[PDB]
């Protein structure tokens, strides 16, 4: 995969950011529900 | 027979410690 | 011949009676030459003669383990083992050969020798091909899965339900139960200081808690009413493993000394 990215630890994971926003909405939407 | 045969390999192995001291000779 | 006599004896159960028939027959395959795996191809022995020779091992072992002997079992097994697994050995093959090693792995398993147990699975020729297809073979590792790390719940349950336990295996099942719990005992001892006598019994799967209370006191466990206590979960101090580490400077001094000789003998 390519050559040199920042490499390690590790690939981490994926679908977080929007998931966060999806929740950041929901969170705040829950907080809207709050 | 082979009684004294490998007896060389004793001192035949000693060939080295010579050369250490030989390395040492120079080294000294 | 003694061949079928014992073969009938075993067939009749009566494995006590079956026992003494073995050694004479064992003296046969001496001359019958079968008992020793014949490296020179004999053409037909394995099935010419050595058939029940391959079985008398099974049979004798089968009875021995049924009579709750193990080496004998294993001895015979060890002898079956080539006829069991020579390498190639399709020349003859049988079934409870699975059961036997199953019993014997489970034996090894009860024998609490981890690597050899597993490395026997490695020494096993066909492994999964053999293994997974035999519930008996499927016991030990799946058990081990449970067993090894120390949650026994279904495993311990399984062996009560074990068809081999239900057939021949209840020998170690008993042992194993105890064998299990002693680790949990420590695991509890590790996990817990003060545990209700109910829970530990709940853990030990006992009906009477005085069942446990022995163990705890057999373990020498501090206990008040209703609760097993661990004031010392461990053996700390206790004689040997001393005079080395603390090897603080001494070793490092020698290390220093060494290093300094690595400095000195550097000359």
């Amino acid at each position: 995969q390519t050559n040199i990215w920042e490499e390690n630890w590790d690939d981490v994971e994926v679908d977080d950011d929007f998931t966060n926003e999806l929740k950041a909405e929901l969170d705040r939407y829950k907080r809207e529900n709050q | 027979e082979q009684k004294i045969q490998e007896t060389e390999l004793k001192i035949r192995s000693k060939t080295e410690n010579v050369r250490r001291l030989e390395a040492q000779r120079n080294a000294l | 011949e003694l061949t079928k006599s014992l073969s009938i004896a075993f067939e009749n159960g009566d494995y006590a009676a079956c026992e003494k028939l073995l050694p004479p027959i064992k003296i046969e395959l001496i001359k019958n030459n079968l008992l020793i795996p014949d490296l020179s191809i004999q053409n037909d022995i394995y099935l010419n003669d050595l058939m029940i020779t391959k079985r008398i091992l099974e049979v004798g072992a089968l009875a021995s383990i049924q009579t709750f002997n193990f080496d004998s079992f294993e001895n015979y097994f060890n002898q079956l083992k080539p006829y069991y697994f020579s390498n190639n050995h399709k020349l003859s093959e049988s079934d409870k050969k699975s059961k036997l090693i199953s019993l014997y792995l489970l034996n090894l398993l009860s024998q609490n020798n981890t690597t050899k147990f597993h490395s026997e699975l490695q020494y096993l020729d066909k492994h999964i091909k053999n293994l997974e297809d035999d519930s008996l073979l499927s016991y030990p590792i799946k058990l081990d899965r449970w067993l090894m790390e120390g949650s026994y719940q279904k495993a311990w349950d399984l062996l009560q339900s074990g068809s081999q336990n239900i057939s021949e295996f209840d020998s170690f099942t008993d042992i194993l139960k105890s064998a299990i719990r002693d680790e949990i005992a420590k695991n509890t001892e590790l996990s817990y200081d003060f545990l209700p006598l109910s829970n530990i019994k709940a853990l030990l799967f006992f009906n009477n808690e005085k069942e446990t209370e022995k163990f705890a006191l057999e373990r020498n466990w501090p206990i008040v009413n209703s609760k097993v206590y661990f004031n010392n979960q461990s053996k700390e101090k206790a004689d040997y493993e001393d005079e080395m580490m603390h090897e603080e400077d001494q070793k490092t001094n020698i290390i220093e000394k060494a290093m300094d000789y690595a400095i000195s003998i550097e000359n």
Binding site: - | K14, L21, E22, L28 | -
Partner: protein, 39 residues
């Protein structure tokens, strides 16, 4: 067996051959230092 009593035995020398040296080793070693002084 045979030629070694001839041959083999002559290696005892080569053993000493070492034994000549590590002796003389410390020599230069010390001969160094007291001389290492004046230089």
């Amino acid at each position: 067996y045979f030629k070694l009593k001839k041959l083999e035995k002559e290696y005892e020398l080569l053993t000493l051959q070492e034994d000549y040296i590590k002796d003389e080793q410390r020599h230069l070693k010390r001969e160094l230092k007291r001389a290492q002084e004046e230089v």
